[PDB]
Design a protein around this ligand. Structure first.
Ligand SMILES: Cc1n[nH]c(C)c1-c1cc(Cl)c(Nc2ccccc2C(=O)NO)c(Cl)c1
Ligand SMILES: O=C(O)CNC(=O)C(=O)O
Length: 424
């Protein structure tokens, strides 16, 4: 197993024949105006401490990420990677001061890279509607990254091609719009040179075709066009210096915007008599499908939104308070839904209800309350791991003790979920 750099004579033809949807636009092709601003914006965001390592999860194991990142993008948009939902620090489009300046820079960078990507995708088609090109370049977020490699005690070796040290292992960028492009601005402060940063590429499934290691110098950009991200894997090979990147994506956010999740809560609350907001929650229907939907939405807001947000110790507050009202509002909507689950439970215990209507209700809601119990343990335990204790550390929220009648239901549902089974 081997790899090719610009030192190898075969590099230039292997690029053209086995990695042609990869494009490089070097520092020289980007205006000096933009370089200074974009690099000052990285240094700005680093100074204020806006970039954090994430307490991610992979195959059961709780792991801290080598690199430090922040997500910037459209207001209300999220990007999920490695079971962790990141929330946009918003950039200004259609309606704390140094930080708003940096976000606007990365919007300016976003606009530039978009025109470069559309252009590059035109040229790819000429070789091989025009709305498809537009939507596959319509970047809604950028994930900024940072790693000082001298503050890692030992870096993993690249295992298939001898590319040396890896900052990020071989992967695909998850959760992107199908065939969408990715644009990356890179900024560093025998085989491949160990002191220089490279992006590595290989074909999926394949360690026989030699991989490419693309040297990245101060302000070089690369572009993964079309189905590249799916057919190929990439890695980041570490240099000796620290290095930033801004990686612009079209995040598949069909169930990942503030608007989308508010609307889902609005949908669950259609089954609640809504004259007044108090603890007397009563429901319009107990038709199985309506109750199932309500309980599924309760989980969605709790686990995809509330617990994902508060697991990040309010690292967002530091740079922006955009998500503060939204998340208070989502919690209150979730709290009402606790009221709903309580009201459904009340109804199944009613002397008066035919067992036949009771059993049809349980089959509607049990998978949802099952899944609420398991994920509550997973999230609670994940907030309590020895690694998490070491610290703005991860808050388990919402959480409440049994001796607390502000909440209609208990956090531990084992009593409750177990009782509903023995019947059915
Ligand atoms: C998936 C996906 N979608 N979008 C993105 C940004 C990713 C993504 C992000 C990261 Cl940060 C990592 N890396 C690691 C993560 C945890 C621990 C170690 C490493 C590492 O690789 N050290 O060896 C990989 Cl592999 C993928
Ligand atoms: O070059 C980069 O830093 C971008 N690549 C990645 O997979 C990443 O976002 O970590």
């Amino acid at each position: 197993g081997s790899h090719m750099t610009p030192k190898d004579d075969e590099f230039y033809q292997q690029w053209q024949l086995l990695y042609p949807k990869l494009i490089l636009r070097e520092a020289s092709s980007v205006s000096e105006e933009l370089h200074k601003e974009v690099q000052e914006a990285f240094l700005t965001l680093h100074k204020h401490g806006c970039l954090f390592r994430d307490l991610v999860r992979i195959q059961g194991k709780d792991l801290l990420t080598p690199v430090s990142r922040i997500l910037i993008g459209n207001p209300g948009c999220t990007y999920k990677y490695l079971n962790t939902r990141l929330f946009t620090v918003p950039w200004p489009v259609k309606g704390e001061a140094e930080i708003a300046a940096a976000c606007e820079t990365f919007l300016k960078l976003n606009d530039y890279l978009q025109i470069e990507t559309i252009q590059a995708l035109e040229e790819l088609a000429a070789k091989e509607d025009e709305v498809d090109i537009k939507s596959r370049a319509a970047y809604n977020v950028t994930l900024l990254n940072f790693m000082d490699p001298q503050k890692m005690p030992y870096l993993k070796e690249e295992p298939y091609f001898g590319m040396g040290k890896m900052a990020v292992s071989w992967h695909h960028d998850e959760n992107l719009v199908d065939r969408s492009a990715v644009a990356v601005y890179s900024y560093s402060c025998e085989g491949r040179d160990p002191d220089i940063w490279h992006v590595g590429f290989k074909i999926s499934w394949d360690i026989e075709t030699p991989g490419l290691a693309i040297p990245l110098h101060q302000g070089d950009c690369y572009f993964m066009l079309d189905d590249l991200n799916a057919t190929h894997q990439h890695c980041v090979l570490a240099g000796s210096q620290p290095r930033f990147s801004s990686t612009h994506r079209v995040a598949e956010c069909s169930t990942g915007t503030l608007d989308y999740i508010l609307q889902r809560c609005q949908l669950a609350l259609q089954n609640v008599c809504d004259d007044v907001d108090n603890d007397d929650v009563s429901l319009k229907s107990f038709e199985p499908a309506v109750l199932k939907q309500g309980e599924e939405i309760h989980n969605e807001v709790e686990f995809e939104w509330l617990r994902q947000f508060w697991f990040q110790g309010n690292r967002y507050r530091k740079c922006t308070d955009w998500w503060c009202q939204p998340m208070a509002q989502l919690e209150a909507l979730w709290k009402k839904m606790e009221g709903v689950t309580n009201a459904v439970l009340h109804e199944v215990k009613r002397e008066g209800l035919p067992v036949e209507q009771r059993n049809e209700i349980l089959t509607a809601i049990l998978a949802s309350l099952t899944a609420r119990q398991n994920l509550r343990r997973e999230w609670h335990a994940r907030c309590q791991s020895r690694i998490a204790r070491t610290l703005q550390k991860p808050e388990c929220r919402p959480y409440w003790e049994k001796d607390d009648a502000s909440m209609p239901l208990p956090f531990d549902l084992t009593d409750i979920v177990s009782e509903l089974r023995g019947q059915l």
